[PDB]
Amino acid sequence: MIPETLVMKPDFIGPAYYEKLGNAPRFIFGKEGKYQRHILNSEKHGAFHVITPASTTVFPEDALVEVVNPIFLSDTALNGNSVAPALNVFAEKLVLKK
DSSP: OOSOOSSSOHHHHSOEEEEEEEEOOOEETTEEOOEEEEEEEOTTTSOEEEEEEOOSOOOOTTSEEEEOOOBSOOOSSOOSSTTSSOOEEEOSOEEEOO
16 A cells, blocks of 8 residues: 555666766676666666666767666665665666657
8 A cells, every 4th residue: 555666666667867888797697798887867766777788879868768677686675775776787778768
């Protein structure tokens, strides 16, 4: 009965401002590769960190991009900072729209 999930998962659904792209993730889940990490900020969570495999498509900052299915960290029960923008998830993809 508590206002929590209206559609699916607020964070994921809610588009976020494209802050900056910083290359850093090289080895995830014991697997090497070339990943581009981008900071995304949206009021509901303030901010959140999404990792995505290196694409050729860039994304103008300030713009709202939509994050495709991100998995790495799950806000299930207790994560300590479950109300602070210290989220770290590997997103499928992301698209700038509106």
